[PDB]
Amino acid sequence: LYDRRSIFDAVAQSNCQELESLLPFLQRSKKRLTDSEFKDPETGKTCLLKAMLNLHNGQNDTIALLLDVARKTDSLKQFVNASYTDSYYKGQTALHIAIERRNMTLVTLLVENGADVQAAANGDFFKKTKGRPGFYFGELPLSLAACTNQ
Amino acid sequence: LAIVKFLLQNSWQPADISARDSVGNTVLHALVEVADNTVDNTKFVTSMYNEILILGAKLHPTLKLEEITNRKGLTPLALAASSGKIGVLAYILQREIHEPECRHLSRKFTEWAYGPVHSSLYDLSCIDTCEKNSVLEVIAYSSSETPNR
């Protein structure tokens, strides 16, 4: 069995083992990696997104496994494309983060598993400082990738 | 430096890193006293200071070195500011250290950085140091004797 907490901890330390029994779990319960219960109820963060924050050397293969699991249930598209919902990071997707981190490899990977390239990150974190701040590029992956000189 | 190390680290008698001279000054106080506001002066005092702290935290972690008052009631910082040793006071204000045991020593910690962007966090002892002295208070009403107020 797996609750939200269980996976998020596994992800935090790049553990691909504690997620050995993962796929077969939501096969029995037919639960989806995308269920309401597998996201933070106030931000909309998913395990893939936790993984995106918990990088070590711009690397995490909990990602590769996490994606793999989502296709086997074909949560695939809406999984890779889930966005933040809090006023701060609203509309931020994993692809936004990969770029923010200047990580070709993870941009490449996300685009190949079908990240929406037109997804607008539009929360207060992506507009001019309250100061909050900060910082605006606006919104769309291309725009980001240019404004950060990439 | 090497002899500073050998004094504190030797087998025969390790130096007491917190001892006070006749005036109440510790090595951190003396360093502040030895500053003369020239660029190469600041530079050497500044990092020898750094070095002492790194050694304090390595060898004797419990010791809150900065906080030790000279006879006149002055922490090293507050002396720096009483005597217009600005480069050094500024360095203390800007101190940031990252290594195991780093956090206790550091003055500034940075938390939010976005691809553009940066944030700096300050402690800050000078503003809130009601109990003995404030950095602002020492600066705000200086002697006007001092070379750099």
Side-chain angles (χ1 to χ4, degrees), chain A residues 44-53 55 63 66-67 76-84 89 91-103 106-111 113-116 119 121 126 141 144, chain B residues 114:
Chain A
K45 205 214 308 199
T46 61
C47 32
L48 199 218
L49 275 166
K50 169 89 171 186
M52 286 304 150
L53 287 326
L55 285 167
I63 300 163
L66 250 41
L67 294 149
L76 188 263
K77 261 218 144 218
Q78 68 264 206
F79 177 64
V80 91
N81 284 324
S83 45
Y84 275 87
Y89 293 120
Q92 180 174 58
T93 62
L95 186 55
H96 289 108
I97 303 181
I99 308 179
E100 280 156 83
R101 296 290 181 275
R102 328 186 77 80
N103 200 329
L106 292 205
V107 153
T108 330
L109 188 74
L110 269 19
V111 154
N113 305 284
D116 179 25
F126 310 106
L144 182 55
Chain B
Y114 206 150

mmCIF file of all heavy atoms in Angstrom, chain A residues 44-53 55 63 66-67 76-84 89 91-103 106-111 113-116 119 121 126 141 144, chain B residues 114:
data_model
loop_
_atom_site.group_PDB
_atom_site.id
_atom_site.type_symbol
_atom_site.label_atom_id
_atom_site.label_comp_id
_atom_site.label_asym_id
_atom_site.label_seq_id
_atom_site.Cartn_x
_atom_site.Cartn_y
_atom_site.Cartn_z
ATOM 1 N N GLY A 44 -1.651 21.501 -5.472
ATOM 2 C CA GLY A 44 -1.853 20.640 -6.632
ATOM 3 C C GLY A 44 -0.579 19.946 -7.080
ATOM 4 O O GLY A 44 -0.510 19.430 -8.190
ATOM 5 N N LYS A 45 0.427 19.942 -6.211
ATOM 6 C CA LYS A 45 1.703 19.293 -6.476
ATOM 7 C C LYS A 45 1.518 17.779 -6.541
ATOM 8 O O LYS A 45 0.755 17.194 -5.761
ATOM 9 C CB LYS A 45 2.697 19.643 -5.369
ATOM 10 C CG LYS A 45 4.177 19.559 -5.748
ATOM 11 C CD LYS A 45 5.071 19.091 -4.564
ATOM 12 C CE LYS A 45 4.886 19.881 -3.263
ATOM 13 N NZ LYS A 45 6.050 19.691 -2.363
ATOM 14 N N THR A 46 2.217 17.162 -7.488
ATOM 15 C CA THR A 46 2.200 15.713 -7.679
ATOM 16 C C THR A 46 3.579 15.180 -7.347
ATOM 17 O O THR A 46 4.516 15.956 -7.138
ATOM 18 C CB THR A 46 1.893 15.351 -9.135
ATOM 19 O OG1 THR A 46 2.915 15.897 -9.974
ATOM 20 C CG2 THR A 46 0.536 15.900 -9.571
ATOM 21 N N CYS A 47 3.715 13.859 -7.312
ATOM 22 C CA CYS A 47 5.010 13.255 -7.013
ATOM 23 C C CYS A 47 6.074 13.660 -8.030
ATOM 24 O O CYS A 47 7.215 13.967 -7.666
ATOM 25 C CB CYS A 47 4.884 11.742 -6.929
ATOM 26 S SG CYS A 47 3.635 11.129 -8.035
ATOM 27 N N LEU A 48 5.697 13.659 -9.304
ATOM 28 C CA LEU A 48 6.586 14.124 -10.365
ATOM 29 C C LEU A 48 7.091 15.535 -10.080
ATOM 30 O O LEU A 48 8.265 15.837 -10.295
ATOM 31 C CB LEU A 48 5.873 14.083 -11.719
ATOM 32 C CG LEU A 48 6.767 14.111 -12.959
ATOM 33 C CD1 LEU A 48 6.141 14.960 -14.054
ATOM 34 C CD2 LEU A 48 8.155 14.623 -12.606
ATOM 35 N N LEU A 49 6.198 16.393 -9.603
ATOM 36 C CA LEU A 49 6.554 17.751 -9.255
ATOM 37 C C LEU A 49 7.441 17.814 -7.996
ATOM 38 O O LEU A 49 8.442 18.544 -7.993
ATOM 39 C CB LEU A 49 5.300 18.626 -9.173
ATOM 40 C CG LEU A 49 4.831 19.206 -10.531
ATOM 41 C CD1 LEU A 49 3.430 19.779 -10.455
ATOM 42 C CD2 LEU A 49 5.775 20.264 -11.088
ATOM 43 N N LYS A 50 7.113 17.029 -6.959
ATOM 44 C CA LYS A 50 8.018 16.866 -5.802
ATOM 45 C C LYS A 50 9.412 16.437 -6.281
ATOM 46 O O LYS A 50 10.431 16.989 -5.836
ATOM 47 C CB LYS A 50 7.452 15.875 -4.766
ATOM 48 C CG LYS A 50 8.425 15.413 -3.638
ATOM 49 C CD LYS A 50 8.440 16.298 -2.378
ATOM 50 C CE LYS A 50 9.271 15.634 -1.254
ATOM 51 N NZ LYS A 50 9.257 16.307 0.094
ATOM 52 N N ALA A 51 9.437 15.472 -7.210
ATOM 53 C CA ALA A 51 10.671 14.991 -7.812
ATOM 54 C C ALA A 51 11.376 16.122 -8.503
ATOM 55 O O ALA A 51 12.588 16.177 -8.480
ATOM 56 C CB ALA A 51 10.389 13.883 -8.781
ATOM 57 N N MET A 52 10.612 17.033 -9.104
ATOM 58 C CA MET A 52 11.203 18.154 -9.841
ATOM 59 C C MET A 52 11.895 19.149 -8.892
ATOM 60 O O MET A 52 12.881 19.820 -9.246
ATOM 61 C CB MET A 52 10.160 18.850 -10.748
ATOM 62 C CG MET A 52 9.757 18.081 -12.039
ATOM 63 S SD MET A 52 11.253 17.557 -13.271
ATOM 64 C CE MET A 52 10.446 15.977 -13.976
ATOM 65 N N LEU A 53 11.377 19.227 -7.673
ATOM 66 C CA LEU A 53 11.957 20.087 -6.639
ATOM 67 C C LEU A 53 13.129 19.387 -5.931
ATOM 68 O O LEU A 53 14.160 20.000 -5.593
ATOM 69 C CB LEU A 53 10.865 20.540 -5.652
ATOM 70 C CG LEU A 53 9.833 21.610 -6.116
ATOM 71 C CD1 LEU A 53 10.404 22.668 -7.073
ATOM 72 C CD2 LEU A 53 8.582 21.018 -6.729
ATOM 73 N N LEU A 55 15.677 17.629 -6.800
ATOM 74 C CA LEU A 55 16.781 17.264 -7.663
ATOM 75 C C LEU A 55 18.073 17.130 -6.875
ATOM 76 O O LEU A 55 18.335 17.897 -5.951
ATOM 77 C CB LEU A 55 16.975 18.320 -8.736
ATOM 78 C CG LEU A 55 15.961 18.317 -9.869
ATOM 79 C CD1 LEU A 55 16.089 19.588 -10.667
ATOM 80 C CD2 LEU A 55 16.165 17.108 -10.756
ATOM 81 N N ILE A 63 11.619 10.132 -11.417
ATOM 82 C CA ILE A 63 10.912 10.722 -12.551
ATOM 83 C C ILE A 63 10.661 9.673 -13.625
ATOM 84 O O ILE A 63 9.509 9.354 -13.922
ATOM 85 C CB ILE A 63 11.691 11.907 -13.159
ATOM 86 C CG1 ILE A 63 11.897 12.997 -12.106
ATOM 87 C CG2 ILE A 63 10.960 12.457 -14.361
ATOM 88 C CD1 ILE A 63 12.962 14.009 -12.452
ATOM 89 N N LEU A 66 8.397 7.196 -12.401
ATOM 90 C CA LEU A 66 7.078 7.759 -12.151
ATOM 91 C C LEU A 66 6.288 7.908 -13.436
ATOM 92 O O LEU A 66 5.118 7.505 -13.496
ATOM 93 C CB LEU A 66 7.175 9.085 -11.407
ATOM 94 C CG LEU A 66 6.697 9.116 -9.945
ATOM 95 C CD1 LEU A 66 7.116 7.887 -9.133
ATOM 96 C CD2 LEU A 66 7.159 10.394 -9.265
ATOM 97 N N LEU A 67 6.932 8.463 -14.462
ATOM 98 C CA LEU A 67 6.343 8.565 -15.797
ATOM 99 C C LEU A 67 5.941 7.181 -16.315
ATOM 100 O O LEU A 67 4.794 6.959 -16.704
ATOM 101 C CB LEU A 67 7.342 9.183 -16.756
ATOM 102 C CG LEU A 67 7.731 10.634 -16.502
ATOM 103 C CD1 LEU A 67 9.156 10.849 -16.965
ATOM 104 C CD2 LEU A 67 6.782 11.624 -17.197
ATOM 105 N N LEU A 76 -0.758 9.026 -18.330
ATOM 106 C CA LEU A 76 0.440 9.676 -18.855
ATOM 107 C C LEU A 76 0.310 11.163 -19.158
ATOM 108 O O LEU A 76 1.047 11.956 -18.577
ATOM 109 C CB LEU A 76 1.045 8.906 -20.047
ATOM 110 C CG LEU A 76 2.423 9.308 -20.634
ATOM 111 C CD1 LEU A 76 2.270 10.222 -21.859
ATOM 112 C CD2 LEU A 76 3.430 9.908 -19.614
ATOM 113 N N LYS A 77 -0.610 11.549 -20.036
ATOM 114 C CA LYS A 77 -0.656 12.952 -20.471
ATOM 115 C C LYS A 77 -1.007 13.938 -19.352
ATOM 116 O O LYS A 77 -0.288 14.936 -19.154
ATOM 117 C CB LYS A 77 -1.557 13.160 -21.701
ATOM 118 C CG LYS A 77 -0.792 13.239 -23.036
ATOM 119 C CD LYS A 77 -1.407 14.276 -23.997
ATOM 120 C CE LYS A 77 -0.317 14.997 -24.826
ATOM 121 N NZ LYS A 77 -0.583 16.460 -25.059
ATOM 122 N N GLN A 78 -2.085 13.654 -18.615
ATOM 123 C CA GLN A 78 -2.555 14.574 -17.571
ATOM 124 C C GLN A 78 -1.637 14.562 -16.361
ATOM 125 O O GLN A 78 -1.672 15.470 -15.541
ATOM 126 C CB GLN A 78 -4.033 14.341 -17.183
ATOM 127 C CG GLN A 78 -4.329 13.038 -16.458
ATOM 128 C CD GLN A 78 -4.818 11.898 -17.377
ATOM 129 O OE1 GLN A 78 -5.524 10.988 -16.920
ATOM 130 N NE2 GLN A 78 -4.441 11.942 -18.665
ATOM 131 N N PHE A 79 -0.803 13.529 -16.278
ATOM 132 C CA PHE A 79 0.176 13.415 -15.209
ATOM 133 C C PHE A 79 1.332 14.379 -15.436
ATOM 134 O O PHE A 79 1.637 15.215 -14.577
ATOM 135 C CB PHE A 79 0.684 11.970 -15.109
ATOM 136 C CG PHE A 79 1.757 11.774 -14.075
ATOM 137 C CD1 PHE A 79 1.490 11.979 -12.720
ATOM 138 C CD2 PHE A 79 3.037 11.381 -14.454
ATOM 139 C CE1 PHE A 79 2.486 11.808 -11.764
ATOM 140 C CE2 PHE A 79 4.042 11.199 -13.500
ATOM 141 C CZ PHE A 79 3.762 11.413 -12.156
ATOM 142 N N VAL A 80 1.960 14.263 -16.602
ATOM 143 C CA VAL A 80 3.063 15.131 -17.011
ATOM 144 C C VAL A 80 2.612 16.598 -17.178
ATOM 145 O O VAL A 80 3.441 17.514 -17.198
ATOM 146 C CB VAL A 80 3.710 14.591 -18.320
ATOM 147 C CG1 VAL A 80 3.042 15.195 -19.541
ATOM 148 C CG2 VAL A 80 5.191 14.859 -18.348
ATOM 149 N N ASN A 81 1.297 16.815 -17.282
ATOM 150 C CA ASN A 81 0.761 18.158 -17.501
ATOM 151 C C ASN A 81 -0.016 18.781 -16.356
ATOM 152 O O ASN A 81 -0.671 19.807 -16.548
ATOM 153 C CB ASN A 81 -0.086 18.197 -18.766
ATOM 154 C CG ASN A 81 0.757 18.215 -19.996
ATOM 155 O OD1 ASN A 81 1.819 18.815 -20.017
ATOM 156 N ND2 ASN A 81 0.300 17.544 -21.032
ATOM 157 N N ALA A 82 0.049 18.187 -15.172
ATOM 158 C CA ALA A 82 -0.664 18.744 -14.026
ATOM 159 C C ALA A 82 -0.006 20.049 -13.554
ATOM 160 O O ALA A 82 1.219 20.168 -13.547
ATOM 161 C CB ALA A 82 -0.727 17.731 -12.903
ATOM 162 N N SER A 83 -0.820 21.024 -13.170
ATOM 163 C CA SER A 83 -0.295 22.334 -12.804
ATOM 164 C C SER A 83 -0.609 22.741 -11.372
ATOM 165 O O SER A 83 -1.546 22.243 -10.774
ATOM 166 C CB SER A 83 -0.773 23.408 -13.793
ATOM 167 O OG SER A 83 -2.152 23.290 -14.100
ATOM 168 N N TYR A 84 0.198 23.654 -10.835
ATOM 169 C CA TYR A 84 -0.037 24.256 -9.517
ATOM 170 C C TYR A 84 -1.342 25.053 -9.521
ATOM 171 O O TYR A 84 -1.728 25.616 -10.545
ATOM 172 C CB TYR A 84 1.139 25.173 -9.118
ATOM 173 C CG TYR A 84 2.309 24.475 -8.449
ATOM 174 C CD1 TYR A 84 3.324 23.905 -9.211
ATOM 175 C CD2 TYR A 84 2.398 24.386 -7.054
ATOM 176 C CE1 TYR A 84 4.405 23.256 -8.602
ATOM 177 C CE2 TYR A 84 3.475 23.730 -6.432
ATOM 178 C CZ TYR A 84 4.483 23.173 -7.220
ATOM 179 O OH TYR A 84 5.564 22.521 -6.638
ATOM 180 N N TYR A 89 2.227 29.764 -7.441
ATOM 181 C CA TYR A 89 2.882 29.069 -8.556
ATOM 182 C C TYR A 89 1.883 28.664 -9.668
ATOM 183 O O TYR A 89 2.227 27.906 -10.588
ATOM 184 C CB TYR A 89 3.628 27.835 -8.026
ATOM 185 C CG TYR A 89 4.849 28.079 -7.122
ATOM 186 C CD1 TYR A 89 4.890 27.583 -5.812
ATOM 187 C CD2 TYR A 89 5.984 28.744 -7.603
ATOM 188 C CE1 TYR A 89 6.015 27.771 -4.994
ATOM 189 C CE2 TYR A 89 7.115 28.934 -6.799
ATOM 190 C CZ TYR A 89 7.127 28.447 -5.496
ATOM 191 O OH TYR A 89 8.237 28.644 -4.710
ATOM 192 N N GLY A 91 -0.467 27.340 -12.330
ATOM 193 C CA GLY A 91 -0.251 26.991 -13.735
ATOM 194 C C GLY A 91 1.142 26.489 -14.077
ATOM 195 O O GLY A 91 1.428 26.157 -15.237
ATOM 196 N N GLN A 92 2.013 26.429 -13.075
ATOM 197 C CA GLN A 92 3.321 25.821 -13.265
ATOM 198 C C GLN A 92 3.233 24.307 -13.400
ATOM 199 O O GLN A 92 2.593 23.632 -12.584
ATOM 200 C CB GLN A 92 4.276 26.174 -12.129
ATOM 201 C CG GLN A 92 5.653 25.554 -12.314
ATOM 202 C CD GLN A 92 6.661 26.006 -11.282
ATOM 203 O OE1 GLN A 92 6.465 25.835 -10.075
ATOM 204 N NE2 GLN A 92 7.768 26.580 -11.760
ATOM 205 N N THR A 93 3.912 23.806 -14.436
ATOM 206 C CA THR A 93 4.010 22.380 -14.794
ATOM 207 C C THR A 93 5.441 21.923 -14.566
ATOM 208 O O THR A 93 6.332 22.746 -14.408
ATOM 209 C CB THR A 93 3.740 22.162 -16.309
ATOM 210 O OG1 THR A 93 4.736 22.857 -17.066
ATOM 211 C CG2 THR A 93 2.377 22.653 -16.712
ATOM 212 N N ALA A 94 5.676 20.618 -14.605
ATOM 213 C CA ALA A 94 7.030 20.086 -14.538
ATOM 214 C C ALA A 94 7.944 20.687 -15.620
ATOM 215 O O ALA A 94 9.078 21.042 -15.339
ATOM 216 C CB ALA A 94 7.015 18.578 -14.606
ATOM 217 N N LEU A 95 7.454 20.842 -16.843
ATOM 218 C CA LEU A 95 8.289 21.440 -17.907
ATOM 219 C C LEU A 95 8.803 22.846 -17.554
ATOM 220 O O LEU A 95 9.935 23.213 -17.900
ATOM 221 C CB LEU A 95 7.553 21.467 -19.245
ATOM 222 C CG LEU A 95 8.350 21.937 -20.471
ATOM 223 C CD1 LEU A 95 9.646 21.131 -20.680
ATOM 224 C CD2 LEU A 95 7.492 21.940 -21.738
ATOM 225 N N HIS A 96 7.972 23.631 -16.864
ATOM 226 C CA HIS A 96 8.403 24.948 -16.453
ATOM 227 C C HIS A 96 9.643 24.775 -15.604
ATOM 228 O O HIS A 96 10.677 25.392 -15.872
ATOM 229 C CB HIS A 96 7.308 25.671 -15.694
ATOM 230 C CG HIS A 96 6.156 26.093 -16.553
ATOM 231 N ND1 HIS A 96 4.926 25.477 -16.504
ATOM 232 C CD2 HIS A 96 6.053 27.072 -17.485
ATOM 233 C CE1 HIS A 96 4.109 26.066 -17.359
ATOM 234 N NE2 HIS A 96 4.770 27.034 -17.972
ATOM 235 N N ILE A 97 9.552 23.894 -14.616
ATOM 236 C CA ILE A 97 10.636 23.699 -13.652
ATOM 237 C C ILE A 97 11.945 23.254 -14.324
ATOM 238 O O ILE A 97 13.024 23.721 -13.940
ATOM 239 C CB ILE A 97 10.241 22.701 -12.548
ATOM 240 C CG1 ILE A 97 8.967 23.156 -11.829
ATOM 241 C CG2 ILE A 97 11.379 22.524 -11.567
ATOM 242 C CD1 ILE A 97 8.522 22.219 -10.709
ATOM 243 N N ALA A 98 11.843 22.365 -15.323
ATOM 244 C CA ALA A 98 13.018 21.783 -15.993
ATOM 245 C C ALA A 98 13.799 22.876 -16.652
ATOM 246 O O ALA A 98 15.035 22.822 -16.711
ATOM 247 C CB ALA A 98 12.600 20.779 -17.052
ATOM 248 N N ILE A 99 13.050 23.849 -17.184
ATOM 249 C CA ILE A 99 13.631 24.985 -17.864
ATOM 250 C C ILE A 99 14.204 25.941 -16.822
ATOM 251 O O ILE A 99 15.378 26.357 -16.918
ATOM 252 C CB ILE A 99 12.615 25.718 -18.735
ATOM 253 C CG1 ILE A 99 11.891 24.733 -19.678
ATOM 254 C CG2 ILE A 99 13.319 26.851 -19.483
ATOM 255 C CD1 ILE A 99 10.823 25.356 -20.604
ATOM 256 N N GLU A 100 13.396 26.273 -15.823
ATOM 257 C CA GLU A 100 13.878 27.094 -14.751
ATOM 258 C C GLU A 100 15.208 26.579 -14.241
ATOM 259 O O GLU A 100 16.062 27.360 -13.837
ATOM 260 C CB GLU A 100 12.856 27.136 -13.615
ATOM 261 C CG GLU A 100 11.732 28.104 -13.884
ATOM 262 C CD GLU A 100 10.489 27.759 -13.106
ATOM 263 O OE1 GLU A 100 10.380 28.141 -11.923
ATOM 264 O OE2 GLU A 100 9.620 27.083 -13.687
ATOM 265 N N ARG A 101 15.394 25.269 -14.275
ATOM 266 C CA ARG A 101 16.619 24.672 -13.783
ATOM 267 C C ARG A 101 17.675 24.502 -14.863
ATOM 268 O O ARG A 101 18.745 23.972 -14.582
ATOM 269 C CB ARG A 101 16.333 23.324 -13.115
ATOM 270 C CG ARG A 101 15.457 23.430 -11.875
ATOM 271 C CD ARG A 101 16.178 24.109 -10.670
ATOM 272 N NE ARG A 101 15.296 24.158 -9.502
ATOM 273 C CZ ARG A 101 14.387 25.112 -9.256
ATOM 274 N NH1 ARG A 101 14.233 26.164 -10.071
ATOM 275 N NH2 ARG A 101 13.625 25.005 -8.173
ATOM 276 N N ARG A 102 17.381 24.946 -16.087
ATOM 277 C CA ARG A 102 18.352 24.899 -17.195
ATOM 278 C C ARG A 102 18.813 23.450 -17.505
ATOM 279 O O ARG A 102 20.019 23.167 -17.668
ATOM 280 C CB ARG A 102 19.591 25.766 -16.891
ATOM 281 C CG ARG A 102 19.375 26.993 -16.050
ATOM 282 C CD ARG A 102 20.661 27.791 -15.990
ATOM 283 N NE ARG A 102 20.867 28.535 -17.231
ATOM 284 C CZ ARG A 102 20.266 29.694 -17.526
ATOM 285 N NH1 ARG A 102 19.418 30.253 -16.666
ATOM 286 N NH2 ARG A 102 20.526 30.299 -18.680
ATOM 287 N N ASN A 103 17.846 22.546 -17.576
ATOM 288 C CA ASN A 103 18.125 21.128 -17.618
ATOM 289 C C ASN A 103 17.611 20.559 -18.934
ATOM 290 O O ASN A 103 16.460 20.140 -19.031
ATOM 291 C CB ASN A 103 17.457 20.461 -16.417
ATOM 292 C CG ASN A 103 18.043 19.126 -16.095
ATOM 293 O OD1 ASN A 103 18.513 18.412 -16.980
ATOM 294 N ND2 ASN A 103 18.028 18.767 -14.818
ATOM 295 N N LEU A 106 16.066 17.007 -18.865
ATOM 296 C CA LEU A 106 14.712 16.906 -18.332
ATOM 297 C C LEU A 106 13.666 17.617 -19.191
ATOM 298 O O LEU A 106 12.515 17.194 -19.228
ATOM 299 C CB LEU A 106 14.646 17.360 -16.875
ATOM 300 C CG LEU A 106 15.352 16.518 -15.791
ATOM 301 C CD1 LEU A 106 14.665 16.754 -14.426
ATOM 302 C CD2 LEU A 106 15.450 14.997 -16.094
ATOM 303 N N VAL A 107 14.058 18.695 -19.872
ATOM 304 C CA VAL A 107 13.191 19.292 -20.876
ATOM 305 C C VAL A 107 12.937 18.196 -21.910
ATOM 306 O O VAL A 107 11.799 17.784 -22.113
ATOM 307 C CB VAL A 107 13.845 20.507 -21.564
ATOM 308 C CG1 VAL A 107 13.289 20.697 -22.965
ATOM 309 C CG2 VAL A 107 13.648 21.768 -20.767
ATOM 310 N N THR A 108 14.012 17.705 -22.531
ATOM 311 C CA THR A 108 13.924 16.642 -23.516
ATOM 312 C C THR A 108 12.971 15.540 -23.016
ATOM 313 O O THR A 108 12.010 15.182 -23.702
ATOM 314 C CB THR A 108 15.325 16.027 -23.795
ATOM 315 O OG1 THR A 108 16.341 17.023 -23.596
ATOM 316 C CG2 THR A 108 15.429 15.450 -25.202
ATOM 317 N N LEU A 109 13.211 15.021 -21.817
ATOM 318 C CA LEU A 109 12.424 13.887 -21.368
ATOM 319 C C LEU A 109 10.935 14.227 -21.286
ATOM 320 O O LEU A 109 10.095 13.465 -21.763
ATOM 321 C CB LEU A 109 12.935 13.330 -20.042
ATOM 322 C CG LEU A 109 12.221 12.028 -19.699
ATOM 323 C CD1 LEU A 109 12.715 10.900 -20.575
ATOM 324 C CD2 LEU A 109 12.395 11.693 -18.244
ATOM 325 N N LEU A 110 10.621 15.380 -20.701
ATOM 326 C CA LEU A 110 9.234 15.793 -20.508
ATOM 327 C C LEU A 110 8.488 15.992 -21.808
ATOM 328 O O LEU A 110 7.354 15.528 -21.931
ATOM 329 C CB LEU A 110 9.173 17.079 -19.706
ATOM 330 C CG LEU A 110 9.075 17.073 -18.187
ATOM 331 C CD1 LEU A 110 9.487 15.760 -17.582
ATOM 332 C CD2 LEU A 110 9.913 18.234 -17.655
ATOM 333 N N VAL A 111 9.110 16.690 -22.763
ATOM 334 C CA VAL A 111 8.564 16.858 -24.118
ATOM 335 C C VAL A 111 8.275 15.510 -24.842
ATOM 336 O O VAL A 111 7.271 15.373 -25.567
ATOM 337 C CB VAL A 111 9.459 17.808 -24.968
ATOM 338 C CG1 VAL A 111 9.342 17.528 -26.441
ATOM 339 C CG2 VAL A 111 9.076 19.240 -24.728
ATOM 340 N N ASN A 113 7.629 12.575 -23.339
ATOM 341 C CA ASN A 113 6.500 11.942 -22.685
ATOM 342 C C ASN A 113 5.316 12.913 -22.683
ATOM 343 O O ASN A 113 4.381 12.780 -21.894
ATOM 344 C CB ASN A 113 6.875 11.453 -21.283
ATOM 345 C CG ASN A 113 8.080 10.540 -21.298
ATOM 346 O OD1 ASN A 113 7.986 9.374 -21.671
ATOM 347 N ND2 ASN A 113 9.226 11.071 -20.898
ATOM 348 N N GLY A 114 5.379 13.901 -23.573
ATOM 349 C CA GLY A 114 4.205 14.669 -23.944
ATOM 350 C C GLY A 114 3.830 15.875 -23.109
ATOM 351 O O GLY A 114 2.652 16.233 -23.058
ATOM 352 N N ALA A 115 4.814 16.511 -22.473
ATOM 353 C CA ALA A 115 4.597 17.792 -21.801
ATOM 354 C C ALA A 115 4.015 18.831 -22.774
ATOM 355 O O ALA A 115 4.485 18.947 -23.900
ATOM 356 C CB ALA A 115 5.891 18.304 -21.195
ATOM 357 N N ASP A 116 2.978 19.552 -22.329
ATOM 358 C CA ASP A 116 2.361 20.601 -23.114
ATOM 359 C C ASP A 116 3.299 21.776 -23.138
ATOM 360 O O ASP A 116 3.658 22.354 -22.106
ATOM 361 C CB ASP A 116 1.039 21.052 -22.523
ATOM 362 C CG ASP A 116 0.402 22.165 -23.341
ATOM 363 O OD1 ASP A 116 0.703 22.264 -24.555
ATOM 364 O OD2 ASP A 116 -0.398 22.946 -22.785
ATOM 365 N N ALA A 119 1.837 25.474 -22.084
ATOM 366 C CA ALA A 119 1.256 25.640 -20.753
ATOM 367 C C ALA A 119 1.741 26.934 -20.125
ATOM 368 O O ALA A 119 2.946 27.175 -20.034
ATOM 369 C CB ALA A 119 1.597 24.458 -19.865
ATOM 370 N N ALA A 121 2.445 29.329 -17.108
ATOM 371 C CA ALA A 121 2.679 29.479 -15.684
ATOM 372 C C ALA A 121 2.346 30.914 -15.355
ATOM 373 O O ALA A 121 3.133 31.800 -15.683
ATOM 374 C CB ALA A 121 4.131 29.197 -15.369
ATOM 375 N N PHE A 126 5.199 34.334 -11.164
ATOM 376 C CA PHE A 126 5.581 34.530 -12.569
ATOM 377 C C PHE A 126 5.205 35.899 -13.140
ATOM 378 O O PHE A 126 5.221 36.091 -14.373
ATOM 379 C CB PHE A 126 4.919 33.451 -13.406
ATOM 380 C CG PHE A 126 5.128 32.080 -12.863
ATOM 381 C CD1 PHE A 126 4.100 31.411 -12.233
ATOM 382 C CD2 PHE A 126 6.362 31.457 -12.971
ATOM 383 C CE1 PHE A 126 4.289 30.146 -11.726
ATOM 384 C CE2 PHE A 126 6.551 30.195 -12.466
ATOM 385 C CZ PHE A 126 5.511 29.543 -11.831
ATOM 386 N N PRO A 141 6.696 28.376 -21.859
ATOM 387 C CA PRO A 141 8.037 27.741 -21.905
ATOM 388 C C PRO A 141 9.027 28.422 -22.832
ATOM 389 O O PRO A 141 10.132 28.752 -22.395
ATOM 390 C CB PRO A 141 7.728 26.330 -22.373
ATOM 391 C CG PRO A 141 6.353 26.071 -21.776
ATOM 392 C CD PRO A 141 5.615 27.363 -21.887
ATOM 393 N N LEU A 144 9.961 31.803 -21.330
ATOM 394 C CA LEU A 144 10.888 31.487 -20.273
ATOM 395 C C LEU A 144 12.281 31.210 -20.842
ATOM 396 O O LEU A 144 13.274 31.866 -20.458
ATOM 397 C CB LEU A 144 10.367 30.259 -19.525
ATOM 398 C CG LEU A 144 11.108 29.692 -18.322
ATOM 399 C CD1 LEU A 144 11.325 30.756 -17.276
ATOM 400 C CD2 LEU A 144 10.318 28.522 -17.754
ATOM 401 N N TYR B 114 15.343 32.491 -8.040
ATOM 402 C CA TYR B 114 14.685 32.178 -9.303
ATOM 403 C C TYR B 114 15.602 32.563 -10.462
ATOM 404 O O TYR B 114 16.444 33.451 -10.333
ATOM 405 C CB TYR B 114 13.347 32.906 -9.418
ATOM 406 C CG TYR B 114 12.361 32.212 -10.328
ATOM 407 C CD1 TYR B 114 10.995 32.308 -10.107
ATOM 408 C CD2 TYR B 114 12.798 31.456 -11.407
ATOM 409 C CE1 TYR B 114 10.090 31.673 -10.936
ATOM 410 C CE2 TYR B 114 11.902 30.818 -12.241
ATOM 411 C CZ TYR B 114 10.550 30.930 -12.001
ATOM 412 O OH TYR B 114 9.653 30.295 -12.829
#
